[PDB]
Amino acid sequence: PIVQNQMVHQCISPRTLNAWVKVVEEKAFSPEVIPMFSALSCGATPQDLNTMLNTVGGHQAAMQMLKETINEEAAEWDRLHPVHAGPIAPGQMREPRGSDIAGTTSTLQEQIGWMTHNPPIPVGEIYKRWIILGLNKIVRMYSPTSILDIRQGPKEPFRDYVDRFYKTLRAEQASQEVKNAATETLLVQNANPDCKTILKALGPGATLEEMMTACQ
Amino acid sequence: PIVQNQMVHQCISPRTLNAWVKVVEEKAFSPEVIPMFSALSCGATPQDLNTMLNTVGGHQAAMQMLKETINEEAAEWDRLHPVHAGPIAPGQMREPRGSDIAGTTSTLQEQIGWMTHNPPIPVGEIYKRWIILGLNKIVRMYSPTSILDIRQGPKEPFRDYVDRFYKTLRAEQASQEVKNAATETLLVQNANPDCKTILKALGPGATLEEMMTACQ
Amino acid sequence: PIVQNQMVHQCISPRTLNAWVKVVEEKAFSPEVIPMFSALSCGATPQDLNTMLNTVGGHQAAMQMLKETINEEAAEWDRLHPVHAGPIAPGQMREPRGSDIAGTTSTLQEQIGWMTHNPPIPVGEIYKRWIILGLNKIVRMYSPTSILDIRQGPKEPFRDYVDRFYKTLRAEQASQEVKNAATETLLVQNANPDCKTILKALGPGATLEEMMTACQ
Amino acid sequence: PIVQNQMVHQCISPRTLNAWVKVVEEKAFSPEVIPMFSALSCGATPQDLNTMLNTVGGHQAAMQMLKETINEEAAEWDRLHPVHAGPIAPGQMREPRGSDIAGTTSTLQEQIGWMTHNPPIPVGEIYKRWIILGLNKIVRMYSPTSILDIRQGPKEPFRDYVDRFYKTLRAEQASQEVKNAATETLLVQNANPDCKTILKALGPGATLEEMMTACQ
Amino acid sequence: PIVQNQMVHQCISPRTLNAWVKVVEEKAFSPEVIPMFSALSCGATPQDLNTMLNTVGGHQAAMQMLKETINEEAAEWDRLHPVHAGPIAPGQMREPRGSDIAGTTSTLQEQIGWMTHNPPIPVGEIYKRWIILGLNKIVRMYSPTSILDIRQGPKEPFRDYVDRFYKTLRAEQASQEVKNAATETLLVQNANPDCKTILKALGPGATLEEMMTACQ
Amino acid sequence: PIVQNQMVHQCISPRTLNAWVKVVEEKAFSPEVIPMFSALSCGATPQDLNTMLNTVGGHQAAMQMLKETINEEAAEWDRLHPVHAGPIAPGQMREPRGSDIAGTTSTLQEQIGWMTHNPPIPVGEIYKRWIILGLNKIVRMYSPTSILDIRQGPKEPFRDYVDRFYKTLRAEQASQEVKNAATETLLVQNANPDCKTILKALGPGATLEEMMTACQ
Numbered sequence A, B, C, D, E, F: 001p002i003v004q005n006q007m008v009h010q011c012i013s014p015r016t017l018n019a020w021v022k023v024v025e026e027k028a029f030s031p032e033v034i035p036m037f038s039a040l041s042c043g044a045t046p047q048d049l050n051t052m053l054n055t056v057g058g059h060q061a062a063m064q065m066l067k068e069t070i071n072e073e074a075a076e077w078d079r080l081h082p083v084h085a086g087p088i089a090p091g092q093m094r095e096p097r098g099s100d101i102a103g104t105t106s107t108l109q110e111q112i113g114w115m116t117h118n119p120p121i122p123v124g125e126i127y128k129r130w131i132i133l134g135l136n137k138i139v140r141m142y143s144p145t146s147i148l149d150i151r152q153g154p155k156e157p158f159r160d161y162v163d164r165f166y167k168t169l170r171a172e173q174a175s176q177e178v179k180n181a182a183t184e185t186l187l188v189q190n191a192n193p194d195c196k197t198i199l200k201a202l203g204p205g206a207t208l209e210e211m212m213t214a215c216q
Ligand SMILES: CCOC(=O)CN1CC(=O)Nc2ccccc21
Pocket: A050, A051, A053, A054, A063, A064, A066, A067, A070, A071, A074, A098, A099, A102, A103, A104
C-alpha cells in the first residue's frame, strides 16, 4: 500500500495476500466479503488492488463482469476528466485517465506520485470505489434466494428465521430504508401463524428486539 | 486504528480482522465476546468499528437489533449536542452528529481529525460505548437459560454446577451486586440436598471458596 | 500494555489475547498457567489484566472466587493507603484506591498516568500481584489429588512416578522447602518395594539424580 | 528485498519463503500463481528471485524451460547492451550483463549497488520481467484444455460454465481483446440449447451480466 | 529479553513462550531441545529464563533435578564471589549472589541494571550456562539406550543405522573426540557382517562418507 | 543474524528456528533444502548457523559427515591464513582461524566484531560456504536413483517423466552444462518409443518446450 513513517510505498504483506485469497475461497461472494476486501486493501495502490483481484484463481465469470464494470467506470471518468494529449512537461506529473486509475496503463511510480502529492490525486480510493460498486453487482447476482421465499418453518425458532431474512436482504442489496421498514411488513407476513399471531398483537411501533422476544 | 509514533492512523491488521471474525464464528454472542470485541477494537476509528461489524456474515438479526440501538444512541446524541447548520468555516473542524460518530456520514479524515485534535473529540470510544451497550442487549436476549433452571444434578460435582450458574448469571447480565449476593441465596437453594445440607451448616459469612471446599 | 520507544501505551496484541484464551482452554488451572499468565501480561495496565480475565468464557466459579480475592486485596490496600476525599487539585494526579488498582473505578488515562509517572505508581504490577495470589488459591482448590495418594505402581517406571509426585506437589502449592525435603521422606515411602529397597540402600544425602538412576 | 527506512537490503522473510512454496504446492502453474509470484517478490533482488525459484522441489521440467527463457532474455540483453571488457575503474559500478541481471554472475553487493543507485539500474524488476514472461509460457503449456472443449452441460448452471470458460481462457493466455470479444461468439455457441436460445434472443450489445441473468 | 534500539528490556513474545512449550511437548528431552532452548532465550533475563522453565506443565522430576543443579551452581558462585553484607550505598548497584543470578532473589530492575551496565554483569548468560549444564545431565539420564545396544539389523540400510548410532551418541553426551573416533571402532564392530566385511576392506583413514558409500 | 537500523546483532526469530526444523522434517535432504537453508540464514553469525544445524534432532549421520567437511574446510583455512600466536594487542581484534569461522572457538562478540568491522571479515558468509558445500555432498549421497534408471513408462505423460529426470539430475548434482545438454541425449534415449519417435523427428536445435509440446 502507501503508509506513513512522510508517506511511503510498502510491499503488500504475505499475511494480506493470503487473507484475501482464503476469504474468497471460503465465503465466495457472500455480502460480508466486500467490507473485508475494503479492509485488506487499506492504503492500496491500483497495482495492490489488481494484485488482490489477480490472485483469485476461481470466479472468472465474476472477474469478467468486473472488468466490464471497470471499463464503464474508466469510460465515465474520461467523459468527465479528459486529459491533455501530446508530450508531458519534463519532470512533471501527467493527469490520470480511467485506465491509469484502474492500473492497466499507469506505473507504480506514477500511481505513487498521484497518491503522495499535496493535495493527493487519490487513485487507490477511486479505483476501490469502482471495484466495490462492481463487487456488489456480483453479490445481488449470486444472491440465490428472494426475500419472498424467506418464510419461517412451523418448528423454526424466530431468531433462526430473522437471520436468513436479513442475510438474504443483505445479499439482495436492499437499501437501509427497506431494512428499517422490512420489519413492520414482510418479516411478520413471512412468519409462521403462531408467531405471526403474537407479532400482530404487538401492533405498530414494536422494535425487532420487542418482536424477537414476543416470539422466542 | 489511531496509534502513536504523534498520533497517526494505522490500517486494521489482517491479524485483527481475522481474530474478530473467528471469535464470532466460534463463540457467537457468549458474554466473553464483548471484552474481546473491545480489545480487538483498541484505538479503532468509527470506520474500523463498522469494518469489524460489517465483516460478520452471520447473525444478521443481531446486527439489525444493533443498527436499532445505534439509531437510538445517535438520536440521543443529537438531542444533547445539536450541530450548527449551514457552511462550515473554511479549513475548520465541523462538530460531529450521531451518524458522524456511527461512521455512516463522517469520512476517515473527518474521524481522524476529531480523535487526533487537542483535546480529542473521542468518536472511536463514543461509538464503541454505543456498539457495546447494544451488544449486551443481544447477550441477555441470546441467554438461553434462566438462573432458576440452573440447579445441581444429584451426581454433578458442585464446581461444575457453579460454573453453569455464574456463566448463566453472566449471559443473563445480572449486576455485580446480585453476583456478590447470589451466593448466600439461590446458589445454595439450587444445590442438591447432600451439598445443600453441608452449605446450610456453614451459615452466613461463608465465602465461595469455603462453600466450594465444603461440597468438593 | 505500557512499553518503550519514552514509556507509551500499546494495544494488547491479537496474538496475546488469543494465547491466554487458548492456554485457559487447554490447561484450565494447571499450575504452569500462572507463570504463563504473568508472561502474557508483561507491561499490562489494569484494563489489559481485566481484558485477559474477561475474555475467559468458562471457569466462572474460578472467576468469582477471584473477584473475592481481589475485593479483599482492594480492601487491605484501602486500609493501608487511605485516599484524600473531595476535589482533586486541577490538572493533578489523584491517589489510587483498591478499585482503581483493580481497574473497576480508574480510566486507561488515569492508569497510564500512575504507571508512566516518575517514580511510577505501579498499578499494573500491584493488581497482577493480587490476581496471581488469587489464581494460586484456585490451583490448590482444583488440585484433584493428595501427595499421599501419589504412590508408584508395581510396574511403573520410577521417572513416571516422580513426574506425578512433583506435578502434584506443584498443584498442591507445597513450599520449595517441602520440595527440597519431599525427596528423603514421602518420595521413598510412596515408591514400590523393589525401588524402595534400592533407595533405602543409598541412605541420606542422595540426590534426586542419584535416587532416579538407582531405580531406573 | 530492497526496502526503505534511505533504500536498504532486507532478508527475505520466512513468511514469504513459505508462502511461495505453499502456493506452488497447492496451485502448481494455475494462471493466478503469476500475479502472486510478482506480489511475494516485491522489492526482490535477483538473489531473492533465484531463492524463490530454487526453493521449489517439484516442477523441474518447468524450471528447466525457465532457464531456457532466461538464457534467451539474457542473450537479447547482451545483444542490446554490450558491456566494456577489461578492468573496472577502481571503486566504481561496472555495467550489468544478462547473467548479472539473472543473478548467476552478479553478487548481492553488486545487485544492491545497481538497484540503490541514482537513478536506479533496476535489475530486480528486469529479471522479474524475464522470469514472468517465462512463467506464462509454462501456464499455456500446462493449460490442459482448449476453449473449444469448454461447452455447457445440459444440466449445468450457466454461471458454473462461464467460470470454466474464462478460467480456461486465462490459462490459454488469450489477449484481453479476445476476452472482451469471446462473449458475443464462442460463449454463446458453446452454451446448451435452452440457454443458447435465450442468449440469441438478446441479440448483440448484451453484457455478460445481462447474458448471465438471462440464463440463470 | 534485553535488546537494542541503547539496550532496553523487551516483553518475551507470545511467539517465543509458545515455541518453547511446544518444543518440550513434542521432543521432551531429546538432545536437540538444548540448542533450541538457548536460541529461544536469546537476550533473556533470569526472569525470562524462569518464565520459560516455569511454563512447562510436565517433566516435574526433570525440573526438580534442575533446581538441584542450580542450587549447586548458585552455591559455587557464592563460594567464589562472596557479597558485602549490610546496607547498599544509596542509589548504587549491589553485587549479585547465586540466587540473584537464578532470579529467585533479584528483581527485573536489578537484573536489568546488571546486564545493561558498562561493562555488563551478564546474569542472563551466566544463569543460562547453569540451566543448560543441568539440562544436559537430564538428556544423558533420559538417554534410553547404550551405544553398545545400537547394532545394525541384517536388512537395515547402513544410513538408517548410522542415524541411530549418532542420535544415541548425542543423547549419551559423548565428547566430540569419541564422535570423531567412534567411526574406526564401534560403528564398524556394531555393523552387520555384509557391511562389516566391506568396511574392514577399506582399512584405516576411511571417512564416514567413504564408509557410508562403501555400504550403501 | 546481523542486520541494519548501523549494523546490529538481532536474535534468530522463533519463526526462523521453526521454518528450518520443519523444512528438514518434511523434505529431509531434497536438493531444494539448500537454497532454503541459505535463505533462512540471511545475515547469520556462525552461532546462528550452529543453532540451525544443532536444532535438527534427526539425520545425525548427515550431521557427522558435515562436521567432517567443516574440519577439512577449517583445516584448509588455517593452511592459507595462519594466525599470530601469543597475546592479542589489548582492546584489538584478533584474526579468525578455521574453528573461529565454524563458531566452536569464537564468541558472539568476537563473531560480531569480525562481521561489523570496516571492511568486514565475513565469517557468517564464509562458514555458510563451508556448510553448503558439505550439505550438497549429502544431497548426491542421499540421491536414491541414477539418471540411467529415470526412463518414461509406456503410459506416463512426457511432462511427468521430465519432472523425475530433472529432479534426479538436481539431486545427482549434475553441472548446469550437463543440464543444458541432457536434453539432446539421455532425455530422448530414456523416453518411450511413441515419444522417442516424435522427438527424433524434430532433430537437433529443438528446445525443451518444443520437445515437451511435440510429446504432449
Ligand atoms: C480499464 C481496464 O481496467 C482493468 O481491467 C482493471 N483490472 C486490471 C487487472 O490487472 N486485473 C483486473 C481483474 C479484474 C478486474 C479488473 C482488473
